[PDB]
């Protein structure tokens, strides 16, 4: 249409007039930074042109595929009159549409959101990169000396053609390498985050396409915000910076609850509603989930702000129910049973490297003594320092591993064997035990007291078909862990004291 | 002849949908907010108009009347309400047809097919698609979808050298499509015949509602595939003097004593094994919580002892009597062989997941013979299936988890075969502690030379070897026992306070035997044995059909735990 | 009265009868013509017994002859025995899925709203290049739709007679014969060679 010609000259006049702060045109600085550093990514906020012209925002929300045919052309024209001979090195320059107001979820992706712009949150997995998958398929025939016509490759499923231009044969058709063109590929499977999924439901997952240089800038196992078009999502912009959150009406009552009558013990009694228990497991559990603060001196000497606890005792007691309760309770809690290696993939014998994992979350390990060499060394590296390196399949990336570790184990033989130390009891050695600051251990109770309480509570749980409530407690965890910062055994007790000060919500 | 009949049947269907305010108008008013358009119309509610004659005429020409029905539905939602896909589903047919009664006289008609799902495929985007020509910029939007999807017969500009061929596009058009495998049920297979299976296609939002390994009932249209006779379903559901005998059998007092000797009439002796097998069949409450998590309310039974015994006979009885019973040999299994096997790129298509022995026959007895010759992978898969009630399968990019509730009948043997008394159960069973756990009851059988019961056993063996003797005659048949099992299954009893007050003292009395033990003791006692006797209490409450349990019936379960 | 249109006929009774010795020696060489004329004569003698006519005027009845003597399987089946009745005793091993066969052909046009129905003539479909000349002229505008076509059941069954013969059953006899039974079968030997079953036992 010729209507794009009156659209083009409108935004060509817009880029030379946007002066929002102190009369300065920021687009000239943006075009000189993309021209001097040879970049192809141009940044445009949605609010700027939306305040300028809402019809362009309506056209971008309705038909972004035809709206993107004007943007790249006017950006290359602005770069060509601002910089001479820029077309010799870079032929096309794309744009990055950011600041989308209506952030959607993965469960709200419906048929009405087709062929439109959408900003969705998620977690990235399955990293396969820099592969030129087919976009125009041709076929060599062996029964005749001809070729098949051009067929557009449907990106979700392969196409089988039996008819050829000369006859009707039974012979197979092969891919012609002299005519087939391949477009780039960034096949990433994105998933919904577990910290905002409703209870009872399962998190969905989609496939995202990444093209024209934004490959390997994303970190697997982290929260991400992607703005793209919906058709399979074709991402335009990625953001590695980022429904159950704190409000203004709930934040005043949290300080009012934290000020009166010693809430540390109430949080401890609110930790285990299913059983009576004892405070030694839940005190370590609450101080590990609430955590401490990470501090550095002049950019170096990074201390670990997480607390890794280790549970031990006979297998008849409860050790998995506490982590099963904290998997639902705490935010970004991952229950595993975190390594980066080259692994086989069954579809067409594919080869890729799977990176490790919850960067701010808590990972829960059950049956710690029953593992191999790779998952022991990876957790020892993540317990020693806070990063996991990937050095395979053509990629080298050192990712952040600042996660808390809650591990549960069993001794060799069932019995704890109290007339021997823990180093002779467990099969583990001392430097893997030194990363765990708190080592909680239970024992067997023969007496009338435990028999009077445990059996009565478990029969009260079966005969039926004061503390802080669960919702306020899980909202208080996210409210205290994201706003305040109150200023090896010595490092551990300072972390436990600052974690108790974090739970007490004090200034120091 | 149906070109003028289609508008009349469209007018009749829209008159049926317009004159009834049936619950259809409020159903459209409810889906107005969500815009899914995957409606459900009952065939029993449609069978009253035109004395059923409107239903009989639609019932044979369903594929020839389907766009007229969707056009009438589109016109009534266009007039009663202001990106448009539609799915009309029919359900609740009065006749249930098998897979062996499908003929070619019902091609194109609607049909109700019941059976069991064997395999499931991945979801795929179906076409339903602008076509560009390589000579000019012409475009078309009227697309065909079943067959001949590449050649449209018209262009907007007829001046061309070749009006036949075009080129497809992937940009301007596309939803979920699935192909599953249905098979003949085990109770309606002919004598000597094979359980013939068939592939059924499914579209709309009827996909991912069918769980693999369950009895299912579909309603759809018989469509031929180049030929083969496939099926298209639109509705999915998870299906699956008598009271004078039942009320007479619940009023007496000696029912349980005939029940423990009538659950296995071919086996001489072993009343404890028969007690655990009879109490294994029916469980207790699994949702006994206030937090929101389901618990293990099932009974796990494991039999051990010396070889050449009659312990496999129970194994051959359960599977010949219980309808919800899957038997495996153990050695002819794996991790994927027991739960979910996968095909690997066969017949041109992608991977397909076939259902194994696990997750089949829910709330029934899965019986595994030779439990100790299995590998480590299937035993940790059994432990992962027993730690949590759901099971997760992560393969080819897709992740799928499902509910499972089965009771394990594990037949094991020692490392040397002969059971020696001088050591514990752990070193003789030869399996690790977490897979040795979550087992409610262990049955150890030892044999020796005791002539008085041995001569009776050998006489029973030689008296059984004849044409249908009364030597294995039970006091009552299985005819009332099946409905008694079902009547006790839908009972749901509730424990009492006096039983709990006696139970805490009984747990203290059972744990007092651990003190100065290593004589009349072979294993540890913790919360798991307490949970086993708690689960056996509601099972004996259901077997005696009492709503409120007394501790005297839990005393027999305490004696059963003391006998093991 | 019960609606069973099938008639089981014993050929041995036609053999011992005083008047029909010329009929038993005529149906062993030409079964396709005598079955087609027996379908008319059985309807004629049934309406002679009648003289219920609202349904038997359009109903069809057939004849299944099985009482014939034994033979030496497929080894004695020489080329002078083509299109003759034959009997095989053995066991079936494999039952294929049901394949459809066209009985009438549908022909939908792209223009002028005229559809054409035609019938099969023992294997060939007469495709009309013409387009019903009372209506408008078109040289090649014609299509074929498979979903509106009428089909009949067909099935190839493996039989162990040792030789493996591929027999083929048709409509109203499908899913009656399957692997596992000692089956006596009889029909017409055709020509790769096969046997078109007239009866199973």
Residue set of the binding site of B: 305-312
Contact B102, B229 (CB under 8 A): yes
Question: B482 — contact with chain A (CB < 8 Å)?
Answer: no
Of A151, C110, A150, give the one whose Cα is nearest residue B154.
C110
* A231 and A290 together in one domain: no
Token pair 């309770």 is found at A329
CA distance A357 to A335: 11
The subunits that touch chain C, with at least 3 C-beta pairs less than 8 Å apart, are B
Q: Are A19 and A25 in contact (CB under 8 A)?
A: yes
In 3D, which of A277, A305, A271, A341 has the Cα closest to residue A499? A305
Distance, in Å, from the CA atom of B108 to the CA atom of B60, rounded to the nearest integer, reads 7
3-state secondary structure of B252: coil
Nearest by CB to B153, which of C110, C113, C174? C110
Distance (Å) from the alpha carbon of B143 to chain C's nearest alpha carbon: 15
- Domain boundaries, position C84: 71-201
Question: Exposure of B226 by Cβ count < 10 A (0-12 exposed, 13-18 middle, 19+ buried)?
Answer: exposed
Domain span holding position A126? 103-134+182-242
Q: A454 and B527: CB-CB below 8 Å?
A: yes
Helix, strand or coil for residue A368?
A: coil
Residue by residue, DSSP assigns B83-113 as: ------EEE--S--B-STT--GGGTTSEEEE
Rounded CA gap, A435 and B560, in Å? 47
Going from the C-alpha of C27 to that of each of A316, A366, C6, C11, C41, the distances in angstroms are 85, 82, 19, 10, 15
Question: How far is the C-alpha of B76 from the C-alpha of B61, rounded, in Å?
Answer: 22
CATH number of the domain located at residue range(s) B96-124+176-240 in this protein:
2.40.50.140
**Residues C68, C11: Cα–Cα separation, whole Å:** 6
A98 and A225, same domain (yes or no) = no
CA pair distance A406, A334, nearest whole angstrom: 10
Q: CATH 3.40.50.300 spans which residues of chain B?
A: 241-564
Contact A448 B508 (CB under 8 A): yes
CA–CA separation, A405 and A358 (whole Å)? 11
User: In chain A, what's the furthest Cα-to-Cα distance?
Assistant: 92
Sign of CA dihedral C185, C188, C194, C199: negative
Which residue's structure tokens are 């009985």? C103
Question: Which element (helix H / strand E) includes B399?
Answer: strand B398-403
Interchain CB contact of B223 with C (< 8 Å): yes
> Are residue A37 and residue A122 in the same domain, yes or no?
no
Length of chain A: 508
Are residues A427 and A456 part of one domain?
yes
Q: Considering only CB atoms, which chain C residues are within 8 Å of B107?
A: 100, 151
Sheet holding B441-445: strands in order across?
B325-328, B365-368, B407-411, B301-305, B441-445
A137 in Cβ contact with A180 (< 8 Å): yes
Buried b / exposed e across C133-145, counting CB within 10 Å, b at 16+?
Answer: eeeeeeeeebeee
Name the structure determination technique: cryo-EM
Nearest CA in chain B to A412: B433
Instruction: Residue A314: list chain B partners with CB under 8 A.
Output: 524, 526
CA distance A129 to A141: 31
Measure the CA–CA gap between B187 and A209, rounded to whole angstroms: 49
Residues 6+ apart with CB under 8 A from C18: none
Q: Other CB atoms closer than 10 Å to residue A269's CB: what's the count?
A: 15
Torsion sign, CA atoms B319, B472, B268, B478: positive
Cβ-based contacts of B526 with chain A (< 8 Å): 314-317
Pairing type for strands A395-400 and A387-392 reads antiparallel
Cβ neighbours of C174 in B, within 8 Å = 103
Q: From the centroid of its chain, how far is CA B506?
A: 38
Both tokens assigned to A78: 């602005």
3-state SS class at B458: helix
Q: In angstroms, rounded to a whole number, what is the distance separating the alpha carbons of residues C182 and C92?
A: 8
Tell whether B107 is within 8 A of chain C (Cβ). yes
CA distance to A427, A440, A500, B168, B431, per residue, from A313 (Å): 14, 9, 26, 65, 20
> For residues B522 and B424, is the Cβ–Cβ distance under 8 A?
yes
Strands B175-183, B197-202: pairing is antiparallel
Q: Do A395 and A498 share a structural domain?
A: yes
Contact B192 C181 (CB under 8 A): yes
Give every CB contact of residue B224 below 8 A, 6+ residues apart in sequence.
B107, B230, C100, C146, C147, C151
Report chain C's C-alpha Rg in angstroms: 21
* A335 and A372 assigned to the same domain: yes
Concatenating the DSSP letter of every residue in A21-53 gives STT-BHHHHHHHHHHHTT--EEEEEHHHHHHH-
For residue B275, the surrounding DSSP H or E stretch is: helix B271-280
Structure tokens at B188: 């309606």
Helix (H) or strand (E) holding C6: strand C6-9
Q: A touches C (3+ CB pairs < 8 Å)? A: no
Q: Breaks in chain B follow which residues, C to N over 2.5 Å?
A: 21, 82, 128, 173, 226, 240
Non-local (6+) Cβ contacts of A443 within 8 A are A313, A314, A416, A418
Q: Is B147 helix (H, G, I), strand (E, B) or coil?
A: coil
Q: What is the DSSP annotation of A120-134?
A: EEEEEE----S--EE
Nearest to B126 by CA among B141, B108, B146: B146
A364 exposure class (CB count in 10 Å sphere: 0-12, 13-18, 19+): buried
B125 contacts in A (CB within 8 Å)?
154, 156-157
Verify whether the Cβ–Cβ distance C148 to B146 is below 8 Å.
no
CA distances (Å), origin B246, targets B257, B323, B488: 17, 20, 11
Q: What b/e readout covers B59-92, taking b as 16+ CB neighbours within 10 angstroms? A: bebbbbbeebbebbbeebbeeeeeeeeebbbbbb
Output phi, psi for C6, to 5 deg. Answer: -80, 145
- On whether both A167 and A251 belong to a single domain, the answer is no
Residue with tokens 């069978």: B47
Q: Which residue of C has its CA nearest to B100?
A: C175
| Distances, alpha carbon A355 to alpha carbons A221, A347, B308, in Å | 8, 19, 53
- Asked whether the beta carbons of A496 and A289 are under 8 A apart, the reply is no
- What pairing do the DSSP bridges indicate for beta strands B352-355 and B110-121? antiparallel
Q: Nearest C-alpha of chain B: how many angstroms from C178?
A: 7
The superfamily in CATH containing domain B1-95 is mini-chromosome maintenance (MCM) complex, chain A, domain 1 (3.30.1640.10)
d(CA A327, CA A364): 8
Ligand-binding annotation for A315, yes or no, is yes
Say if residue A236 is in the same domain as residue A254. no
**Contact A251/A480 with Cβ under 8 angstroms?**
no
| CATH code of A347's domain | 3.40.50.300
Match 């595993």 to its residue by tokens: A336
CB A155, CB A118: distance < 8 Å: no
Q: What residues of A are in contact with residue B168 (Cβ under 8 Å)?
A: 151-152, 154
User: Closest Cα partner for B271 from B453, B116, B421, B528?
Assistant: B453
Helix axes of B527-543 and A448-463: crossing angle, nearest 10 degrees: 40
Contact B406, B366 (CB under 8 A): yes
For the record, the structure tokens of B45 come out as 């509610």
Q: Which helix (H) or strand (E) holds A365?
A: strand A362-365
| Sheet of strand A151-152: strand arrangement | A151-152, A133-137, A181-183
3-class secondary structure for B481-513?
HHHHHHHHHCCCCECCHHHHHHHHHHHHHHHCC
Cβ B64–C148 below 8 Å, yes or no? Answer: yes
Residues in chain B closer than 8 A to C147 (CB atoms): 63, 108, 146, 223-224
Tokens linked to A374: 């790779």
Q: Are the beta carbons of A465 and B134 separated by less than 8 Å?
A: no
The residue whose two tokens read 């003698």 is: C45
Look at A462 and B507 and tell me if their CB atoms are within 8 Å: no
Choose among A80, A69, A97: nearest CA to A3. Answer: A69
**Cβ neighbours for B394, distance < 8 A, ≥ 6 positions apart:** none
Q: How far apart are the first and last CA of chain B?
A: 78
How many angstroms separate the CA atoms of C135 and C158, rounded? 50
Structure tokens at B289: 């919580």
Give residue for tokens 């005793």. C89
Tokens 């969500």 map to which residue? B34
- Both structure tokens of C164: 């493996």
Verify that A380 and A340 share a domain, yes or no: yes
Alpha-carbon torsion angle A106, A112, A114, A119, nearest 10: -40
Domain count, chain A: 4
Asked if B353 and B340 count as a contact pair (C-beta separation under 8 A), the reply is yes
Per the structure block, which two tokens stand in for B138? Answer: 């012409």
For chain B, the farthest-separated pair of C-alpha atoms sits apart, in whole angstroms, at 104
Asked whether A140 and A177 are in contact (CB, 8 A), the reply is: no
DSSP letters, A205-264, are: EEEEE--SS-TT-S-TTSEEEEEEEE--EEEEEEES-------HHHHHHHHHHHHSS-HH
Beta strands B352-355 and B340-342, pairing class: antiparallel
The verdict on domain B241-564 having CATH code 3.40.50.300 is yes
The residue of B60, B104, B195 whose CB has the most chain C CBs within 10 angstroms, and thus the best one to mutate to test that interface, is B104
Name A301's Cβ contacts closer than 8 Å, sequence gap at least 6: none
Q: Which two structure tokens, joined as six digits, stand for B477?
A: 């048949």
Q: How many CB atoms lie within 10 A of CB B447?
A: 14
> Rounded to whole angstroms, how far apart are CA atoms B537 and B558?
9
Which residues lie across from B111 on neighbouring strands?
Answer: B220
Preceding residues of all breaks in chain C (C to N beyond 2.5 angstroms)?
A: 51, 161, 191
Distance CA A271, CA A477 (A): 12
Angle at A261 between CA A255 and CA A262, to 5 degrees: 85
Element (H, E) at B454: helix B451-464
Residues 493-552 of B with CB under 8 A from A: 494-497, 500, 503-504, 507-508, 511, 514-515, 524-528, 530-531, 534
* Alpha-carbon distance B100 to nearest alpha carbon in chain C (angstroms): 7
Pairing of strands A404-408, A309-312: parallel
E strands, A366-411, are 387-392, 395-400, 404-408
Nearest in space to C165 (alpha carbons), one of C174, C173, C156:
C156
Q: Give the number of other Cβ atoms within 10 Å of residue B443's Cβ.
A: 21
Bridge partners (DSSP) of residue B352 are B121
The token pair at C145 is: 């739709």
Give the residue carrying structure tokens 């087709």: A114
CB within 8 A of C105, min separation 6: which ones?
C117, C118, C119, C120, C125, C144, C149
Given a contact cutoff of 8 angstroms between Cβ atoms, the answer to whether B430 and B371 are in contact is: no
The reply to whether A294 and A396 lie within a common domain is yes
Q: What gap in Å lies between CA C97 and CA C101, rounded to an integer?
A: 13
**Best mutation target, B130, B384, B511, to test chain A (most A CBs within 10 A):** B511
**Measured between alpha carbons, how far is B551 from B558 in angstroms, rounded to an integer?**
10
User: Beta strand pairing status for B215-221 and B110-121?
Assistant: antiparallel
Contact B263, B475 (CB under 8 A): no
Breakpoints of chain A, after residues (C–N > 2.5 Å): 231, 242, 337, 357, 465, 487
Closest CA to A267 of A248, A250, A247, A287: A287
R_g over Cα of chain A: 29
CA separation for the pair B180, B454 (Å, rounded): 54
Widest CA span in chain C? 64
Residues A116, A187, single domain; the answer is: yes
- Would you list which residues of B are annotated within the binding site for ATP? 305-312
First to last CA, chain A: 66
Task: Count CA atoms within 13 Å of residue A167 on its CB side.
Answer: 9
By a Cβ cutoff of 8 Å, what residues of chain C touch chain B?
Answer: 95, 97-100, 110, 113, 146-148, 151-153, 171, 174-175, 178-181
DSSP SS3 for A351: strand
A192/A144 same-domain check: no
C76: exposed, middle or buried (C-beta count within 10 Å: 0-12, 13-18, 19+)?
A: exposed
Q: How far from B516 is each of B367, B519, B520, B558, CA to CA, in Å?
A: 37, 8, 10, 20
Answer positive or negative: Cα dihedral of B377, B378, B381, B387: negative
Q: What is the CATH number of the domain that holds A53?
A: 3.30.1640.10
Contact A475, A244 (CB under 8 A): yes
Terminal Cα-to-Cα distance of chain C (whole angstroms): 24
- Alpha-carbon distances of A408 from A317, B328, B475, C33, rounded to whole Å: 12, 34, 53, 86
**CB B407 within 8 Å of CB B299:** yes
Indicate the length of chain C as a whole number.
201
| Structural element, H or E, at residue A75 | helix A64-82
**Beta pairing partners, B403:** B390
Which residues are CB-contacts of A472 (< 8 A; sequence separation ≥ 6)?
Answer: A254, A257
Residues in A closer than 8 angstroms to B344, CB to CB, are 346
Cross-strand bridge partners of residue A353: A342
Please answer whether residues B97 and B111 qualify as being in contact, where contact means their C-beta atoms are separated by less than 8 angstroms.
Answer: yes
Residue B440: burial class (beta carbons within 10 Å; 0-12, 13-18, 19+): buried
DSSP string, C128-187: -SS--TTS---SS-----STTSEEEEEEEEEEE---EEEEEEETTSTTS--TTSEEEEEE
Residue with tokens 């002049």: A298
């Amino acid at each position: 249409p010729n209507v794009s010609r009156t659209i083009a000259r409108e935004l060509k006049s817009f880029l030379l007039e946007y002066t929002d702060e102190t009369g300065r045109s920021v687009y000239g600085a943006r075009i000189r930074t993309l021209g001097e550093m040879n970049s192809e990514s141009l940044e445009v906020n949605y609010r700027h042109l939306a305040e300028s012209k809402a019809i362009l925002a309506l056209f971008l929300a309705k038909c972004p595929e035809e709206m993107l045919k004007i943007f790249d052309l006017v950006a290359m024209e602005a770069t060509e009159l601002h910089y001479p001979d820029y077309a010799r090195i870079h032929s096309e320059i794309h744009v990055r549409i950011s600041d989308f107001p209506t952030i959607y979820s993965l469960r709200e992706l419906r048929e009405s959101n087709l062929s439109s712009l959408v900003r969705v949150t998620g977690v990235v997995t399955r990293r396969t990169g820099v592969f030129p998958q087919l976009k125009y398929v041709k076929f060599n025939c062996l029964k005749c000396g001809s070729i098949l016509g051009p067929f557009f490759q449907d990106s979700n499923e392969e196409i089988r053609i039996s008819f050829c231009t000369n006859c009707k044969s039974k012979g197979p058709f092969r891919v012609n390498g002299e005519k087939t063109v391949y477009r780039n590929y960034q096949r990433v499977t994105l998933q919904e985050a577990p910290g905002t999924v409703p209870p009872g439901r399962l998190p969905r997952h989609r496939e995202v396409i990444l093209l024209a240089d934004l490959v390997d800038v994303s970190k697997p196992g982290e929260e991400v915000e992607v703005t793209g078009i919906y058709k399979i999502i074709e991402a335009n912009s990625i953001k590695r910076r980022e429904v159950f959150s704190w409000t203004e009406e709930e934040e005043r009552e949290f300080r009012k609850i934290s000020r009166d009558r010693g809430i540390i013990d109430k949080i401890i009694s609110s930790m285990a509603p299913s059983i009576y228990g004892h405070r030694d497991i839940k005190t370590a559990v609450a101080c590990s989930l609430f955590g401490g603060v990470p501090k550095n001196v002049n950019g170096k000497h990074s201390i670990r702000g997480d607390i890794n606890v280790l549970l031990l005792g006979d297998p008849g007691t409860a050790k998995s129910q506490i982590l099963k309760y904290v998997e639902k309770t705490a935010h970004r809690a991952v229950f595993a049973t975190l390594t980066a290696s080259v692994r086989k993939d069954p579809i067409t014998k594919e080869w890729t490297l799977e990176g490790g994992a919850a960067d701010k979350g808590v990972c829960l390990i059950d049956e710690f003594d029953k593992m191999n060499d790779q998952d022991r060394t990876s957790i020892h590296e993540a317990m020693e320092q806070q990063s996991i390196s990937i050095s395979k399949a053509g990629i080298v990336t050192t990712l952040q591993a600042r996660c808390s570790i809650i591990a549960a184990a069993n001794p060799n033989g069932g019995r704890y064997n109290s007339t021997l130390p823990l180093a002779q009891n467990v099969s583990l050695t001392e430097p893997i035990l030194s990363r765990f600051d708190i080592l909680c251990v239970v024992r067997d109770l023969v007496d009338e007291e435990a028999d009077e309480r445990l059996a009565t509570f478990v029969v009260d749980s079966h005969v039926r078909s004061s503390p802080i409530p669960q919702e306020l407690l899980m909202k208080y965890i996210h409210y205290a862990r994201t706003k305040i910062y109150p200023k090896r055994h010595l490092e551990s007790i300072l972390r436990i004291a600052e974690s108790f000060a974090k739970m007490r919500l004090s200034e120091f | 002849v149906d070109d003028v009949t289609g508008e009349k049947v469209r007018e009749a269907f829209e008159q049926f949908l317009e004159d009834f305010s049936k619950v259809y108008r409020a159903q459209i008013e409810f889906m107005k907010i969500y815009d899914l358009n995957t409606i459900y119309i009952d065939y029993q509610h449609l069978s009253m108009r035109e004395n059923g004659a409107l239903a009989m005429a639609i019932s044979e020409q369903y594929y020839r009347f389907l766009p007229f029905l969707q056009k009438g539905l589109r016109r009534v939602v266009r007039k009663y309400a202001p990106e448009r896909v539609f799915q009309i589903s029919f359900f609740n047919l009065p006749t249930v047809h098998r897979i062996r009664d499908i003929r070619s006289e019902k091609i194109g008609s609607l049909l109700s097919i019941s059976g069991t799902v064997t395999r499931t495929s991945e979801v795929r985007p179906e076409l339903y698609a602008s076509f560009t020509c390589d000579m000019c910029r012409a475009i078309v939007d009227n697309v065909e979808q079943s067959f001949k999807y590449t050649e449209p017969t018209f262009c907007p500009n007829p001046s061309c050298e070749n009006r036949a061929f075009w080129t497809l596009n992937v940009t301007r058009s596309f939803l979920d499509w699935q192909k599953v495998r249905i098979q003949e049920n085990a109770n309606e297979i002919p004598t000597g015949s094979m359980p013939r299976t068939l592939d059924v296609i499914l579209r709309g939002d009827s996909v991912e509602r069918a769980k693999p390994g369950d009895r299912c009932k579909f309603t759809g249209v018989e469509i031929v595939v180049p030929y083969k006779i496939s099926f298209l379903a639109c509705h999915v559901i998870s299906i699956g003097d008598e009271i004078n005998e039942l009320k007479e059998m619940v009023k007496d007092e000696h029912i349980y004593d005939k029940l423990v000797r009538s659950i296995a009439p071919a086996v001489f002796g072993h009343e404890a094994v028969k007690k655990g097998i009879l109490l294994q069949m029916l469980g207790g409450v699994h949702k006994s919580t206030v937090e929101g998590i389901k618990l293990r309310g099932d009974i796990n039974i494991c039999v051990v002892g010396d070889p050449s015994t009659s312990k496999s006979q129970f194994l051959k009885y359960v599977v010949g009597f219980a309808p919800r019973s899957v038997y495996t040999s153990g050695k002819a299994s794996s991790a994927a062989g027991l739960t979910a096997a996968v095909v690997r790129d066969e017949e041109g298509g992608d991977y397909t997941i076939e259902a194994g022995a696990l997750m089949l026959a829910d709330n029934g007895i899965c019986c595994i013979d030779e439990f100790d010759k299995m590998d480590i992978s299937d035993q940790v898969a059994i432990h992962e299936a027993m730690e949590q009630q759901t099971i997760s399968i992560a393969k080819a990019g897709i992740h799928a988890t499902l509910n499972a509730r089965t009771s394990i009948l594990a037949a094991a043997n020692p490392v040397g075969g002969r059971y020696n008394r001088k050591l514990s159960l752990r070193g003789n069973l030869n399996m690790t502690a977490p897979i040795m756990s979550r087992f409610d009851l262990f049955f150890v059988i030892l044999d020796d030379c005791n002539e008085k019961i041995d001569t009776e056993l050998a006489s029973h063996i030689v008296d059984l070897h004849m044409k249908r003797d009364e030597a294995i005659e039970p006091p009552f048949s299985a005819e009332q026992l099946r409905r008694y099992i079902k009547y006790a299954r839908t009972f749901k009893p509730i424990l009492t306070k006096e039983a709990r007050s006696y139970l805490v003292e009984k747990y203290k009395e059972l744990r007092k035997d651990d003190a100065q033990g290593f004589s009349r003791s072979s294993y540890r006692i913790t919360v798991r044995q307490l949970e086993s006797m708690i689960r056996l209490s509601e099972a004996i409450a259901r077997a005696n059909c009492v709503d409120e349990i007394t501790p005297s019936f839990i005393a027999e379960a305490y004696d059963l735990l003391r006998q093991s | 009265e019960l609606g069973t249109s099938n008639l089981n006929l014993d050929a041995r009774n036609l053999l011992a009868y005083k008047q029909t010795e010329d009929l038993y020696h005529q149906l062993l060489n030409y079964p396709q013509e005598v079955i087609s004329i027996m379908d008319q004569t059985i309807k004629d003698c049934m309406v002679s017994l009648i003289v219920d006519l609202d349904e038997i005027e359009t109903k069809f009845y057939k004849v299944r002859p099985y009482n014939v003597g034994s033979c030496k399987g497929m080894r004695e089946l020489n080329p002078n025995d083509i299109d003759k009745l034959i009997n095989l005793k053995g066991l079936v091993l494999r039952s294929t899925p049901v394949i459809p066969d066209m009985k009438v052909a549908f022909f939908k046009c792209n223009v002028c709203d005229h559809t054409m129905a035609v019938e099969i003539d023992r294997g060939v479909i007469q495709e009309p290049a013409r387009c019903e000349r009372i209506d408008c002229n078109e040289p090649n505008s014609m299509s074929l739709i498979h979903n509106r076509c009428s089909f009949a059941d067909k099935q190839v069954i493996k039989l162990q007679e040792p030789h493996s013969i591929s027999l083929c059953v048709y409509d109203e006899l499908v899913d009656s014969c399957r692997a596992g039974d000692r089956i006596e079968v009889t029909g017409t030997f055709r020509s790769k060679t096969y046997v078109d079953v007239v009866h199973v036992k």
